[PDB]
Design a protein around this ligand. Sequence first.
Ligand SMILES: [K+]
Ligand SMILES: [K+]
Ligand SMILES: [K+]
Ligand SMILES: [K+]
Ligand SMILES: [K+]
Ligand SMILES: [K+]
Ligand SMILES: [K+]
Ligand SMILES: [K+]
Ligand SMILES: [K+]
Ligand SMILES: [K+]
Ligand SMILES: [K+]
Ligand SMILES: [K+]
Ligand SMILES: [K+]
Ligand SMILES: [K+]
Ligand SMILES: [K+]
Ligand SMILES: [K+]
Ligand SMILES: [Mg+2]
Ligand SMILES: [Mg+2]
Ligand SMILES: [Mg+2]
Ligand SMILES: [Mg+2]
Ligand SMILES: [Mg+2]
Lengths: 66, 91, 100, 99, 129
Amino acid sequence: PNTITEENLMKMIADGRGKKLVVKSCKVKLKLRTAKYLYTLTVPNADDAKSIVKGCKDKVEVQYVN
Amino acid sequence: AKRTKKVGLTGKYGTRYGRAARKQLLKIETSQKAKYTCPFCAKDKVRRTACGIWTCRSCSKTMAGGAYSLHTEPANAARATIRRLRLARED
Amino acid sequence: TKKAQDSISLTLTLVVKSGKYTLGTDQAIRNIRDGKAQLVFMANNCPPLVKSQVDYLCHLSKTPVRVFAGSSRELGIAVGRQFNVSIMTILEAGDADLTS
Amino acid sequence: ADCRVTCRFHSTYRTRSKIVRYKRTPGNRLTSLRVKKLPNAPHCAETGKQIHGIPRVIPQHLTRQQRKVSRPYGGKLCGSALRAHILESFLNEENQALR
Amino acid sequence: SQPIIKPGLVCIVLQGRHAGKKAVIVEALPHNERGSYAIVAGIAALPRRITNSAVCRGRVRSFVKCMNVNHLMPTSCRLENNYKDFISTQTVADVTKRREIIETVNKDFQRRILEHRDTWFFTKLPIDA
RNA sequence: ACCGGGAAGGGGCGUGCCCGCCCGUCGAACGGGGAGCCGGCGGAGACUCCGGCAGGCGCGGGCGGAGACGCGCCC
RNA sequence: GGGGGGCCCGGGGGCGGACCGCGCGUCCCCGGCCGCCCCUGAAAAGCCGGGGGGCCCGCGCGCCGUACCGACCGC
RNA sequence: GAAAAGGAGUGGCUCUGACGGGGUCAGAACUGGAACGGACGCGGGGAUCCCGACUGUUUACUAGAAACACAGCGU
Ligand SMILES: [K+]
Ligand SMILES: [K+]
Ligand SMILES: [K+]
Ligand SMILES: [K+]
Ligand SMILES: [K+]
Ligand SMILES: [K+]
Ligand SMILES: [K+]
Ligand SMILES: [K+]
Ligand SMILES: [K+]
Ligand SMILES: [K+]
Ligand SMILES: [K+]
Ligand SMILES: [K+]
Ligand SMILES: [K+]
Ligand SMILES: [K+]
Ligand SMILES: [K+]
Ligand SMILES: [K+]
Ligand SMILES: [Mg+2]
Ligand SMILES: [Mg+2]
Ligand SMILES: [Mg+2]
Ligand SMILES: [Mg+2]
Ligand SMILES: [Mg+2]
């Protein structure tokens, strides 16, 4: 498991390296499940909004707060 | 202040083994614990590592020598004689 | 023999009293490269590779090089030190002559 | 409380490759974790000192770049030894040809 | 008696990536601070075996650098260089110059090799037999 | 049955060349030896199951620094 | 010595994986030294470096042990 | 030889000083059947003679020694 900067995150998205994304509410955690590692990014909700506006439609995103 | 009068380093033996043996060991053990002058290093750093093996702790040469001293008298004399015999073989 | 060695003693003393000199191999090399070294003077137990390169550098510099006829301890004593000295380089001779 | 643990290995004979340390787990438990022996690093062929630049990891787990140094005789000689060899070769050439 | 570090002298390299390789003193630098240095052009790669029965094989790789003189060993040998004319201040920290400088010195070294010049300079020193 | 080197002692490949002096895949569940952690579930098993997160070994679609140093194979 | 650097260091911290301080001591491992020997404290498979010369995504990981016990030997 | 032989103190409570948070060491007043290592743990001592120098070993199951070994000495 490891942490990632958002532009590398979009590289991963745009070259189809992820199988599922998770949004965790708490500062929001974005969790990306790739072949090798699980990558995590932490952004405020304002930035989560635009990252998901930019989210991929070949990409299953699932929400989570509890 | 001085701690023993005569026994020196043989005070480790206590009252055991008799006078003649302890007298011999004082001499032997002082000789084998001494520091010697490195014939290359130029410095007085040679210590014994095994019975006939002496290492200079500064320049790190190893040398073959006596059991309890770095040089022996027979070897001094032999080396002098062999050097003289060589020189006589140079015309 | 005795006359010559006592002259060597007197000149080493004069150089260290009034003159320019260096003790040590690294300074000896730097000065021989520059060509500031009137004389170079070694000990009989100088390490042989170091001796080879000193003699070669001196052959290219035309700096004369001699041998002290005593250990590095002896050279330390002779220039007035408590430590061993493999090379002494004499840069200016002062009130000495360097006739050796 | 009671923090006593049982042995983790096949036998309990405590040789130098069967050493553990202790650590607390997220489930509030005292667990044993093996302590690998640490291999030495390569040493100089001429003087026997640790070669500078190589980590103490078996080379099977290191990439090629990490297992080397960038100099002639990079991982074999320490550099003082290399200098001494170069000087020996050149000066001996000089004293064997032209007197 | 006389200085040895002069701008035509051939040295052996002692430390760094090019240790035990021959080079020429392109220039000598003064002694202000940090010590004593010299612009030096040297051979990084020599050509190789060419049977009768080849450009890549017979190409020649050089290097120019400023080096500490304490890391050099002078020689009797000498190479009458033509590189003083080529500007020696743009060599350093001006990389755009330095790559083209290496190109224009590679060509010349291969040329000297073709005309069979400086046998001692273009031969390899035997180490650690 | 016991004892033992002085024997024309095997390999690479790709034909035809080239290299070669002569043993045991016997002998250690404590020596050497690539690579594992957490949470959970059962009447009886778990570093072995299940979930999660990793690691190892395999197979298929020439540059920088003054320098100490930094950043595909085969014999 | 002083000033500035390089490499190793079974460790620690921050982010991931996912309540707050302060102490003496014990056990274990590690470090640099110092002492000792008419005592000097295994080997090999396997893996790698040097010199010289010639030239990301998928799939898999076979065989055997594994319950329990001082329930063992002394009728 | 030696802990030779022989003497004296030691609880509780209230205080004081010394060492850079931490206990130790030193000192004083008061007090208790004329008590204090209050259980527990824990040498009796000395004057001599014989044998073997010493640490070590032995008749598993009636003998641990003055017997064997030993460094040293000699052939
Ligand atoms: K028979
Ligand atoms: K076997
Ligand atoms: K075996
Ligand atoms: K075993
Ligand atoms: K085994
Ligand atoms: K090599
Ligand atoms: K089991
Ligand atoms: K009291
Ligand atoms: K007895
Ligand atoms: K005893
Ligand atoms: K006894
Ligand atoms: K009996
Ligand atoms: K008995
Ligand atoms: K007894
Ligand atoms: K007895
Ligand atoms: K007996
Ligand atoms: Mg094992
Ligand atoms: Mg069980
Ligand atoms: Mg079990
Ligand atoms: Mg007895
Ligand atoms: Mg009996």
